Design a protein around this ligand. Structure first.
Ligand code: ATP
Ligand code: MG
Lengths: 96, 48, 234, 240, 73, 232, 48, 238, 240
């Protein structure tokens, strides 16, 4: 037996949301990093209706993250961040 | 649906119940959860 | 976590070709404009050290007496493609005795793009798709012609193309300054304006390069003497 | 796990899994029947009408490999077509090498060995079609053979492949097929096909029939339109 | 046809098409279409549901990933 | 078709070939055998034991004569021993077709070891599972050799390979010397094969071959029955 | 399993209102059960 | 999901996933329609472009005097197949001195594209060919798919959002047995007009028409003489 | 016990074993059949059983016995397709031997060459080692009858009485107990013993339509298949 106990936990969590007079007025909200390993029975709708997805920022994202994280700075008044956005192709908010 | 629980009941729909957030590390999902927690009014139980 | 080089994604697109498409964004910018008068091409160099010899690094290189090419992305591998282009043109002239349209050369090259095959044949230009993006500019019987070719194997004729790292901004800004009653001089001036606006470092007569082709003369490129005329006349 | 990936590794209990997956791939095709009479054999195929846009006679599932041998298939169409081509090439090669029509007991073996060559090495995959061969000769009688993906060739008085193999072969065996000639067999086949695939699963379909025997000078071909018209009219009464 | 029974659907849908546009959907997904397409219309403040909303819903619940450029054809 | 074209035996982080070691561990579990030589000839002894009485022991052999004066025996895996014997036969013919002279034993051993080693660096294979003992008599002086799945070869005065082979080595050390007779050699070899022999020793469960400066031969059951008699 | 055969052969007659069994239902039942046992393990096991 | 990495493997439900993926890729192209009358066959294509100052991508290709094709997918494989078509037709003309009948050619294509879906480490060809031709037996419309499977059809539509157009074709199916080219092409355009949203339609720069007939060779009309066909078309009801 | 890829390809385990060969042996038992072979004083006999679950199947084309050569016969156990492939290989090899050397092949050399051919499969990493076992019977001049057996791993050997199938162990026990009598053997004795061994192992008390027998004698080396009539004669004469 491997991971059997954790599997029983997962089954109980699944069962709490479906079958015989469901919970009613409760909303859940989940997150993950590598979702390919999620179980099919958990990803079925009726449990996970929407599958919002967060991707790497494009270009307005980068300049706008710069605007947000640098707006409390004592810096020069005549620098342009668009060049800074161009200089980093695929990067996350953390890097900014 | 919580702050306007009349539009859906009037027209005759029941809103969804779930949502999943996924993406590469550092992208910013946990921060969205914090934002939601700040805004709301009903309880909010966090589990890891 | 390991797949062959010939795998389809769950949404239908290929893997290697998409990655190369994303990779050509790491190169320097390049802008090309076609006008009934003629075609002009402009490119940056990204000089890093004062010990650079700026004339050593070049982007625009002619393919024949009347066809010019602009390259972006990686450079090391494009030499093969340029070589096959030249050899094909000369072979066609030898066999049939005329000059070829830039369109025929474009697709004759593009048929070479998708060849990577792990198994099968003897040494092939395998392993990976090429990483370069190309602009082709020529003058044929139907006037000036400008084509754009891409790592996926797709080629299309355009009027004002911008490729490279800063491609989006150039394309966005270029739409509001173009129409069909265009003339060569003001075209070159507007192109220079755009380049200087999106440049990283300062602008001089050695940080950029231009070339023009008209139906009259052959492929001709400017040197450090006629290049500053438009710079001071900006 | 991981024992079912390639076709070169045995499971601990001692069997190959890829071939079993292929057979399960077969068990979703439509249905086909073939039965032998006193002096010939009769095939019968039911073709589902996927949509109204296609034409009748499209994607024929009956192939006449030679001038005197018929073939019926069930599985994936492309693999079926490739196998049909290789069988046809084998027949012509044999005629050229020696000089007379090939007997069944040899042609079926050649096709079976060629198929079985696709279940050892890991650089190829097993096929996905199961088929039936029929023929008649004046000096050889009536021959029927059936072949599966694994590479097994067997002889039958009458057999059926597809979704409802068991249901069909329930009523195959009731008929006394040892004597009665295959002029009234056709009505039996139409009746035995119309009693399956309920209207709930699908609305409408079409029917194909083949023909071989000395009744047609041993040649293999298709049935005339009036004959199948009469057979369908007859089988319309069996629903009572 | 069962689940969309309550909401005020306009007399113009064509379920015989939608059933053919869905493929490999299990039953729960075919339920979910009927609620997503009910939300889309309210987003634009209209009253009755309309065919195009069902098409949008279908395009939703597949949950296909971002495809960036389309350079095919 | 097409093979795999990449070797399956590679250096471990401690720099040890794993596959050849596992092959040796498999070799150690084979049928025991011993070999001796003393100043007049060479003797090879090995044990065979069929599981049931139904097997016809007259159909197969362990000791195989390559030529009139070279002998070979094995310890370990069953089938590939035949492949190696066939290759050795072929090499012998190839050599004799050049110099019109019987192969000296050392050259034969060198070539066979060459094949065995070459087989561990090719593509998509695994090495053999056998240990070989070779005997010969050329130019008066008798010769004994022992190869190995790794390809290394040695010259031994008397050795033992198989189950409990270390005890056979110790016993031979405590008994073997430099000046003896062929008959005493045969007796002591049979004695050391009886160290851990089966329930009973008969004339058909032991295979013995000899090679003197007159030639190599396999002994018939009559003389085996006689030697087993007046012994033990 | 044979008890089950003898049960199904009756079930096929409770519908169609025959209060008597006939030999065809035994064939039906045997093939119906024959194909349902394709998901047991069929390992014998042995004490040792 | 380890069953999704190579052609050779078989899933437990008996569906290889590579072929399903290739079909899904074919659904990415722009719409295209094809249909036949008693003695003429017409195929219609709707084009696409990226920026307002780039030329539209072409779709219809010219194979031979009595054979034309339409393409949906990625273009490199399309050229790879068209070269084969040209080669075979020329060879048949050179040897037996007669036009190659359409069905034999289609069978050749099926047998050719089947091979890669069986070996190891070989992808399928991603294309959605629609073949329109004329032979001694009259008009012919055929469709292929990446699974090395082809169908015979009398009215078919493929590409993204091709489903509504297919329904429209199904509705007005009978009348093709009496109409002529003038109204036939107008029916085809009516069919294609349904697969567009409620803001933009036909403007003569996004349409291409190919016709073959008993007495007319395969002809392509695009961007100029197309106005004669388009004009006189009733507006979309709203 | 294992690490890496010992369970997927033919490579050595840490303990010295290798599993991809040990799995074929238990793959043998998947069919569910058994065969027995006996060598007499001047005769050789083989007995096998056949099972025909349904009437639709033609009972004349399920024979497991095959005729390799006018003086050599073989009997098959295990899977089906692999069996046919190995049979064809043997026929081809014998014909080539006849072409090359101009006189008949002795049985032992043929068995050796087929087993050696099998041995290569367990040496590389692309193929499957063919799970089906072989029994041969023949007559050799100056040596009388001879019986040999060949297995998938490549270990061939000549026996005096053998059994292959599901019930190997108890049958070998019975044969050992019987042969311990140390008496003379004749044709009737051989056939009676071979029949009763299988009869008591399976405990059937069968009918003449379920068992096939092959024999060879030193008066007419031509291998032959016994007719049902004389099979019935032997069977009824056995029951005193
Ligand atoms: N859109 C954004 N706007 C502002 N800051 C952002 C944005 N996206 C990411 N960040 C920054 O990057 C970091 C994101 O890490 P966070 O703690 O939110 O984890 P995560 O991306 O949700 O997931 P994980 O815990 O798996 O890394 C934060 O420090 C945040 O400041
Ligand atoms: Mg987090």
């Amino acid at each position: 037996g491997g991971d059997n106990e954790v599997q029983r936990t997962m089954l109980e969590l699944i069962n709490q949301l479906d079958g015989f007079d469901p919970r009613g007025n409760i909303k859940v909200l989940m997150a993950t990093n590598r979702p390919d390993t999620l179980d099919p029975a958990l990803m079925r709708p009726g449990r996970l209706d929407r599958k919002i997805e967060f991707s790497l920022p494009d270009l307005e994202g980068r300049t706008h993250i710069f605007k947000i994280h640098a707006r409390s700075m004592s810096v020069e008044r005549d620098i342009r961040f668009e060049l800074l956005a161009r200089l980093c192709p695929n990067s996350t908010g953390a890097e900014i | 649906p919580l702050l306007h629980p009349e539009r859906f009941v009037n027209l005759g729909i029941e809103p969804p119940k779930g949502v999943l957030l996924f993406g590469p590390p550092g992208t910013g999902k946990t921060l969205c959860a914090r934002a939601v927690a700040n805004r709301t009014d009903a309880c909010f139980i966090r589990v890891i | 976590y390991d797949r062959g080089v010939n795998t389809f994604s769950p949404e239908g697109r290929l893997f290697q070709v998409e990655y190369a498409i994303e990779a050509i964004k790491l190169g320097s910018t390049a802008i090309g404009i076609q006008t009934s008068e003629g075609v002009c091409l402009a490119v940056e160099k990204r000089i890093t050290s004062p010990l650079m010899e700026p004339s050593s690094i070049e982007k625009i290189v002619e393919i024949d007496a009347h066809i010019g090419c602009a390259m972006s992305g990686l450079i090391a591998d494009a030499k093969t493609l340029i070589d096959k282009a030249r050899v094909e043109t000369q072979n066609h002239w030898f066999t049939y005795n005329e000059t070829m349209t830039v369109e025929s050369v474009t697709q004759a090259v593009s048929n070479l793009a998708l060849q990577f095959g792990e198994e099968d044949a003897d040494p092939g230009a395998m392993s990976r798709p090429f990483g370069v993006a190309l602009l082709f500019g020529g003058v044929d019987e139907k006037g000036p012609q400008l084509f754009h070719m891409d790592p996926s194997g797709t080629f299309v004729q355009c009027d004002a193309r911008a490729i490279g790292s800063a491609s989006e901004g150039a394309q966005s800004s270029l739409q509001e300054v173009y129409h069909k009653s265009m003339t060569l001089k003001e075209a070159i001036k507007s192109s220079l304006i755009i380049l200087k606006q999106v440049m990283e470092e300062k602008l001089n007569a050695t940080n950029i390069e231009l070339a023009t082709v008209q139906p009259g003369q052959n492929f001709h490129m400017f040197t450090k003497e006629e290049l500053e005329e438009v710079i001071k006349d900006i | 796990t991981g024992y079912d990936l390639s076709a070169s590794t045995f499971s601990p209990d001692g069997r190959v899994f890829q071939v079993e997956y292929a057979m399960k791939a077969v068990e979703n095709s439509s249905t086909a029947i073939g039965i032998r009479c006193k002096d010939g054999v009769v095939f019968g195929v039911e073709k589902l009408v996927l949509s109204k846009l296609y034409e009748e006679g499209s994607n024929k599932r009956l192939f006449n490999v030679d001038r005197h041998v018929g073939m019926a298939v069930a599985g994936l169409l492309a693999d079926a077509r490739s196998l049909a081509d290789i069988a046809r090439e084998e027949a012509s090669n044999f005629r050229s090498n020696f000089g007379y029509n090939i007997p069944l007991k040899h042609l079926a073996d050649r096709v079976a060995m060629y198929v079985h060559a696709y279940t050892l090495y890991s650089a190829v995959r097993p096929f996905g079609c199961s088929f039936m061969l029929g023929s008649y000769s004046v000096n050889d009688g009536a021959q029927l053979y059936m072949i599966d993906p694994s590479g097994v060739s067997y002889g039958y008085w009458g057999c059926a492949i597809g979704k409802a193999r068991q249901a069909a072969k329930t009523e195959i065996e009731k008929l006394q097929m040892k004597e009665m000639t295959c002029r009234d067999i056709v009505k039996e086949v139409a009746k035995i096909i119309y009693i399956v695939h309920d209207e709930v699963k699908d609305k409408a379909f079409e029917l194909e029939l083949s023909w071989v025997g000395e009744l047609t000078n041993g040649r293999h071909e298709i049935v005339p339109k009036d004959i199948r018209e009469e057979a369908e009219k007859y089988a319309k009464e069996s629903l009572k | 046809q069962i689940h969309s029974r309550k909401m005020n659907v306009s007399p113009d849908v064509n379920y015989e098409e939608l059933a053919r546009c869905t493929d490999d959907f299990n039953g729960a997904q075919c339920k979910a279409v009927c609620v997503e397409a009910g939300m889309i219309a309210l987003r634009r403040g209209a009253t009755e549901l309309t065919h195009e909303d069902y098409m949008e819903g279908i395009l939703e619940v597949q949950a296909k990933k971002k495809a960036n450029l389309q350079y095919y054809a | 078709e097409r093979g795999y074209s990449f070797s399956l035996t590679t250096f471990s982080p401690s720099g040890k070939l794993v596959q050849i070691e596992y092959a040796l561990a498999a070799v150690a579990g084979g049928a025991p055998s011993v070999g001796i030589k003393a100043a007049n000839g060479v003797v090879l002894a090995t044990e065979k034991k069929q599981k049931s009485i139904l097997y016809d022991e007259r159909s197969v052999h362990k000791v195989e004569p390559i030529t009139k004066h070279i002998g070979l025996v094995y310890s370990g895996m069953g089938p590939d021993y035949r492949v190696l014997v066939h290759r050795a036969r072929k090499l012998a013919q190839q050599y004799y077709l050049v110099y019109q002279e019987p192969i000296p034993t050392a050259q034969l051993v060198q070539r066979v070891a060459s094949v065995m080693q070459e087989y561990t660096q090719s593509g998509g294979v695994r090495p053999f599972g056998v240990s070989l003992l070779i005997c010969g008599w050329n130019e008066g002086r008798p010769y004994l050799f022992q190869s190995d799945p790794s390809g290394a070869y040695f010259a031994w005065k008397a050795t033992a390979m198989g189950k409990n082979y270390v005890n056979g080595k110790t016993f031979l050390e405590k008994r073997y010397n430099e000046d003896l007779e062929l008959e005493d050699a045969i007796h002591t070899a049979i004695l050391t094969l009886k160290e851990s022999f089966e329930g009973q020793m008969t004339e058909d469960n032991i295979e013995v071959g000899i090679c003197n400066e007159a030639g190599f031969r396999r002994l018939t059951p009559t003389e085996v029955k006689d030697y087993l008699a007046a012994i033990a | 399993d044979l008890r089950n055969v003898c049960t199904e052969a009756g079930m096929f007659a409770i519908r169609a209102d025959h209060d008597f069994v006939v030999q065809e239902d035994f064939m039906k039942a045997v093939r119906k059960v024959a194909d349902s046992k394709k998901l047991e393990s069929k390992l014998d096991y042995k004490p040792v | 999901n380890q069953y999704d990495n190579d052609v050779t493997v078989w899933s437990p439900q008996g569906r290889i996933h590579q072929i399903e993926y290739a079909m899904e890729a074919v659904k990415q192209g722009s719409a295209t329609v094809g249909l036949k009358s008693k003695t003429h066959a017409v195929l219609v294509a709707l084009k696409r472009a990226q920026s307002e100052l780039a030329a539209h991508q072409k779709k219809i290709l010219h194979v031979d005097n009595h054979i034309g094709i339409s393409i949906a997918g990625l273009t490199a494989d399309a050229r790879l197949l068209c070269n084969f078509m040209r080669q075979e037709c020329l060879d048949s003309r050179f040897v037996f001195d007669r036009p190659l009948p359409v069905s034999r050619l289609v069978s050749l294509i099926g047998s050719k594209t089947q091979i890669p879906t069986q070996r190891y480490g070989r992808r399928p060809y991603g294309v959605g060919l629609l073949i329109a031709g004329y032979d001694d037996m009259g008009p012919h419309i055929f469709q292929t798919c990446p699974s090395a499977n082809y169908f015979d059809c009398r009215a078919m539509s493929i590409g993204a959002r091709s489903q509504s157009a297919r329904t429209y074709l199904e509705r007005h199916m009978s009348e093709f047995m009496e109409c002529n080219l003038n109204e036939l092409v107008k029916h085809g355009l009516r069919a294609l007009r349904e697969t567009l949203p409620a803001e933009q339609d036909l403007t003569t720069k996004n349409v291409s028409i190919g016709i073959v007939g008993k007495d007319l060779e395969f002809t392509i009309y695009d961007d100029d003489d197309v106005s004669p066909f388009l004009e006189g078309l009733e507006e979309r009801p709203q | 016990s294992s690490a890496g890829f010992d369970r997927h390809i033919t490579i050595f385990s840490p303990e010295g074993r290798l599993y991809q060969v040990e799995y074929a042996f238990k793959a043998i038992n998947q069919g569910g059949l058994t065969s027995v072979a006996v060598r007499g004083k001047d005769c050789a006999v083989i007995v096998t059983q056949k099972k025909v679950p349904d009437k639709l199947l033609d009972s004349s084309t399920v024979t497991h016995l095959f005729k390799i050569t006018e003086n050599i016969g073989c009997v098959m156990t295990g899977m089906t397709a692999d069996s046919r492939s190995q049979v064809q290989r043997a026929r081809y090899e014998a014909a080539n031997w006849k072409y090359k050397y101009g006189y008949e092949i002795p049985v032992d050399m043929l068995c050796k060459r087929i087993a050696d051919i099998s041995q290569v499969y367990t040496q590389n990493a692309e193929m499957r080692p063919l799970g089906c076992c072989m029994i041969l019977i023949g007559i050799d001049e100056e040596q009388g009858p001879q019986v040999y057996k060949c297995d998938p791993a490549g270990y061939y050997c000549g026996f005096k009485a053998t059994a292959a199938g599901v019930k190997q162990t108890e049958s070998t026990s019975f044969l050992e107990k019987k042969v311990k009598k140390k008496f003379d053997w004749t044709f009737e004795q051989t056939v009676e013993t071979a029949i009763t061994c299988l009869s008591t192992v399976l405990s059937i008390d069968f009918k003449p339509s379920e068992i096939e027998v092959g024999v060879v004698t030193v008066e007419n080396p031509k291998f032959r298949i016994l007719t049902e009539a004389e099979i019935d004669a032997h069977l009824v004469a056995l029951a005193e």
